[PDB]
Symmetry: D2
Subunit: 297 residues, 4 copies
């Protein structure tokens, strides 16, 4: 209950890079400001979408501190501190605390198989280093390879210090079961392409990569379902998925960064290798989308 201030719609921040694959600090600050001015409830920093796993610890800390400088006190700040290593995750959690974040988050540690008790002790250690700011468990089985049962999720979200679950799963039976077992839990829908259905199943917010370019649509789905405008929520999700279809074709992170570049938010839209640049044949569609989204506001 006492972490209700974490509920809402938060973009998973992209990390802008310059032409030589170094962090573009000026464009990062502009992206934070852009998201604030979209009216989002918070920002989620250094997650999957932030290309955390092709960055060093010091690079991730640098991003966390910059975003806190632009955003502390204006919107909720959540730091994704997860690494495979518990000690590395603890370092990032202690940094997030120093910089004034409102919460930390960690993906279930991946690549190596760990027992469920090893997962729990990993979260417990990070929570200790977070030094009193709450933890968001981040579940993304498609990418982590970690396949938790409902009963395991129930144990994770009741660990002391856990205040939320980021549920990047398309299983909306499980989403409803989680909500029914935990009526006050902050529960973020993780797959943008099912946002409206995920809210209906029990999520009370979302963390999403595509919110960086069209957060007003997701805020509008929240409002429509609250108002009882079924058709409007469906038409908004329809338009979101037209965009997601295109992003999946071109490559999601780089497509988002390219749209943001055509919106004059990011100076350079590159991802880090091994992500390739966008193919030239997609540029016209991405620029047209940027133009469409700016007009729609």
């Amino acid at each position: 209950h006492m972490v209700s201030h974490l509920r809402g719609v938060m973009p998973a921040l992209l990390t802008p890079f310059d032409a030589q694959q170094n962090i573009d600090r000026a464009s990062l600050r502009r992206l934070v400001r852009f998201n604030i001015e979209q009216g989002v409830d918070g920002v989620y920093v250094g997650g999957s979408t932030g290309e955390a796993f092709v960055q060093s610890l010091s690079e991730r800390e640098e991003v966390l501190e910059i975003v806190a400088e632009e955003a502390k006190g204006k919107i909720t700040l959540i730091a994704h501190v997860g690494c495979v290593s518990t000690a590395e995750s603890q370092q990032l959690a202690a940094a997030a605390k120093r910089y004034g974040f409102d919460a930390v988050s960690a993906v279930t540690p991946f690549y190596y198989p760990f027992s469920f008790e090893e997962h729990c002790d990993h979260y417990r250690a990070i929570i200790d280093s977070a030094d009193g700011i709450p933890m968001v468990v981040y579940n993304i089985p498609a990418l982590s390879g970690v396949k938790l049962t409902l009963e395991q999720i129930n144990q994770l979200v009741t660990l002391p210090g856990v205040g939320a679950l980021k549920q990047t799963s398309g299983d909306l039976y499980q989403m409803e079961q989680i909500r029914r077992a935990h009526p006050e839990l902050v529960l973020y829908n993780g797959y943008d392409e099912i946002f409206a259905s995920g809210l209906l199943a029990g999520a009370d917010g979302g963390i999403g990569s595509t919110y960086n370019i069209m957060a007003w649509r997701y805020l509008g789905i929240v409002q429509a379902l609250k108002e009882g405008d079924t058709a409007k929520a469906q038409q908004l999700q329809h338009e979101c998925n037209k965009v997601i279809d295109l992003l999946v074709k071109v490559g999601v992170f780089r497509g988002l960064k390219t749209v943001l570049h055509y919106m004059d938010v990011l100076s350079v839209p590159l991802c880090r290798k091994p992500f390739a640049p966008v193919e030239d044949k997609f540029q016209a569609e991405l620029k047209a989308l940027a133009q469409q989204l700016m007009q729609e506001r």
Copy 2:
């Protein structure tokens, strides 16, 4: 468009067996009448839920003809004629036509791997034998092992003679994509536990095993979303999933048949071997559920 009369909420009929595992014809007729009096839009006969794959062809034909005798002209009748064999499926389709069914349906043929073109020719052959009544494609990847792409689904639902898709998939991104590509397609949600979310994603009806014991709840979800009562659709789905949780624990088909026996619909609640009987320790819960559901009406 011209098959809009197929849209709606239809139970996947269970096949009642007697104490020696023979078809219980008297209880079958009472179950059909019970479902009609629940106000369903149709019945789906001889599907997975009907234990088709532990019955012979002649047993499946017997069930189809009995149900048509009780139900033709009162509610929509859909015959699931699918087998692995194309010739066996054709036999059941020709029988369904003789008995006056409104549509046929066939699961993607399973066990052996078949090419997509072999799947299409299988449907084409069944459609020919159906002799002018439309086909419902039935997609259930979890059980069939058949993993169709969106583009393959698009080709199946535009085959001449196909009038609907039974989508037993929890991927509600794909449900929305199907709806967006086919705005007039009759699109049945197949997993009862996500019915409200599946409707929101684009389904315009459902075929479900649990509708046999509580169809009014699913009809109520349809109505709530049409009316814009978000919270009511969520609370109905909540109550449905409390029931589905219990059915999954006890075994779904036999749990449904046991509830129906305690509602005085079926004389004997057995499934065919290798399904075991219900464990004694679950009987109290199942009888209490039957009592609850009868009172709720």
Copy 3:
């Protein structure tokens, strides 16, 4: 121990069909005789390869009785009686007993999820109906969807009346574990393409679809490993897999039947729908293979 007479190399018999998809009884008898004259240790009748799951019970019984008429007393006869239904499997087991088979076999029942105890009771019931001839458990997770643990396999192979395991799995760690736990168990390698490696891991024989066209190669691998001719076993497996590569491209069962037709064993090489016929562009390769195999003898 007392079922050592079941060890060896046995083709999974194909079921020949005529031009109208009816059983071709004359070609079936010739195929049995052909396999006997290849020097095989037994024949496995009515399995996956036999297209059991696109045949009726009476058709499967017809095949079992014909093969017993040609082969009883000359080679070991194993009847695959498995269906999803326990009662149907029992009918085929009782028939196999009447016809004088040496063993029965049943695939783990599929499509519907069953508990492990339901699987065990299914085998127990079939064993009872087999009336004293031993059971071969048939494990094929890729097609059945049934994913048994080692401990579950250990319980199945120690059920009273079980005399063998047909292991159609590419996990040769598990093959070795099974052999180490059951030093006397008759253990059939099920994937022809790893036969030599499967024997080395602990199998003491095999049941295979491609043995119908080149059993002498698999018999030769057995002999080579017994003699300590590592290189000869590898070169034989090499040549087998060149053939399997081609069969996978053209479709395995129909490619085998086509090679047999070009060897003058089968009059008509068709599979039942939904299997398509062989594409014309593959006929030259298949006829050349038949010519090669006949010359190699």
Copy 4:
């Protein structure tokens, strides 16, 4: 052909840690010397088994340089330089070159989905930074989540600068297909528990975590198959798998490090968090195994 000096049996080196999870440099040097004195053909440094993915770049470089100091010129040295990031992998490849390694290796980049062309360009970039020492492609689908086709493997192993494939896959049909397509390719079996069968299928060596405690058994399997002693290769693999069964129960890396500690090779047997320590109840078995292995020499 010109990289035949890479063929053979090489332990995947463990990285010893001290009691505070820092690298134990003295125990690392002793472990290298221990493996040299087992008569191995090479050592594979900084791989999965080396706990690379819970170490920083500078820690991985430190390990590479230490091992080269102990081992350059005495045995083949292969540096696993793979990270998700191409630029990080390039840094480690350039370091491996500086330190005098004989080859580099990189796991297919994981977590994020990459196209096959992105994978190829990743290897090309690392090969460039390796500055003339050959690349070992490392395939481990169970952990990487990367599911390459045979045709994709064929393209990777023919990239300029690729001299070997580390095949951590249990699919021995594919192992044979790779060998048949590439008769001169250096092909390492990656799953120790199927080593004998993998050699028979076409591998000409292996890279393995359990070689750190019993390399003579794997060298003995190579010799037995070369000599035509089928039974001896089977009995050696039998004994290896008894050990692997135990290591899987206790946790493989920490069990290996514990056995090595009881052999007086490593001062401290800890893995890095989130790996837990060994449970006390397993210590007796692990110490008995160490005693057994020392006596067997």
